[PDB]
Amino acid sequence: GDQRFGDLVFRQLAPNVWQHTSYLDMPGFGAVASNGLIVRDGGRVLVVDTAWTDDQTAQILNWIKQEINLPVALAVVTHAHQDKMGGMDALHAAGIATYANALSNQLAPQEGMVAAQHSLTFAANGWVEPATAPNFGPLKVFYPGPGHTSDNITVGIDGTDIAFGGCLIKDSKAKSLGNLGDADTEHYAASARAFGAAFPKASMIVMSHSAPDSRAAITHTARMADKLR
Numbered sequence: 001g002d003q004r005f006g007d008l009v010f011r012q013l014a015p016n017v018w019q020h021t022s023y024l025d026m027p028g029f030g031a032v033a034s035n036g037l038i039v040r041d042g043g044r045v046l047v048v049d050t051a052w053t054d055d056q057t058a059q060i061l062n063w064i065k066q067e068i069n070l071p072v073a074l075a076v077v078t079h080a081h082q083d084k085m086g087g088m089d090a091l092h093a094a095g096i097a098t099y100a101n102a103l104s105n106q107l108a109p110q111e112g113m114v115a116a117q118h119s120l121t122f123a124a125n126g127w128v129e130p131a132t133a134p135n136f137g138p139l140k141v142f143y144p145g146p147g148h149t150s151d152n153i154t155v156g157i158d159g160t161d162i163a164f165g166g167c168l169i170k171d172s173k174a175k176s177l178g179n180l181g182d183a184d185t186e187h188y189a190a191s192a193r194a195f196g197a198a199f200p201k202a203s204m205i206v207m208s209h210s211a212p213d214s215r216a217a218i219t220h221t222a223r224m225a226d227k228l229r
């Protein structure tokens with residue numbers, strides 16, 4: 001059930017949940033797909049992650065207008081790399097309230113990103129401080145510890161079997177942990193396992209660079225990360 005919409009791909013995952021996919025021709029790595037989420041919560045839409053670029057992110061909003069036709073109340077982005085935050089200006093131009101881990105917003109300028117408007121902060125156990133995530137509806141935001149990056153955050157969708165690991169989690173057949181340039185290799189395995197423990201009911205694991213998978217994505221990612229230590 002993939003829907004080609006311009007240069008992007010959209011796939012319904014649940015009655016109120018769709019995955020957005022965008023591509024960037026990155027020299028040395030081919031045309032890399034990146035996934036995020038679109039969630040309808042009653043009369044509004046919530047977005048997880050931008051596309052790689054402003055133009056692609058505007059195209060996500062165009063798809064939302066044509067297929068859902070409800071306002072986008074907010075977006076949350078899951079770390080300060082291009083695939084997750086590269087389209088921040090398009091969200092701001094559209095009047096959408098944007099949220100990121102405080103550390104992502106601090107890192108955004110040096111990473112070439114535009115910061116989100118609002119900062120999420122996290123309790124010692126990883127759960128978002130609820131006052132910093134107002135009106136998130138079914139989105140449950142969890143900081144699992146440093147892994148793919150020090151700022152990576154994850155999102156469960158209450159009322160569904162879906163949890164989103166972003167670039168922390170790779171699929172159950174993945175050959176590597178991908179881009180470790182900003183990774184915490186010592187803590188990766190525990191962070192991947194903490195994501196699994198935060199969302200024990202999630203049987204569909206969504207991630208940045210592979211199609212949705214079973215929880216074997218979590219166990220396999222953690223087992224690969226065991227080897228980094």
Ligand SMILES: O=P(O)(O)Cc1cccc2cccnc12
Pocket residue numbers: 026029032081082083084167178179181208
């Ligand atoms: O780490 P990601 O997935 O957020 C962004 C990304 C994806 C693929 C290859 C990369 C190479 C260098 C830097 N970033 C890359």
Ligand SMILES: [Zn+2]
Pocket residue numbers: 079081148149167
């Ligand atoms: Zn990244």
Ligand SMILES: [Zn+2]
Pocket residue numbers: 083166167178208209
């Ligand atoms: Zn990635």
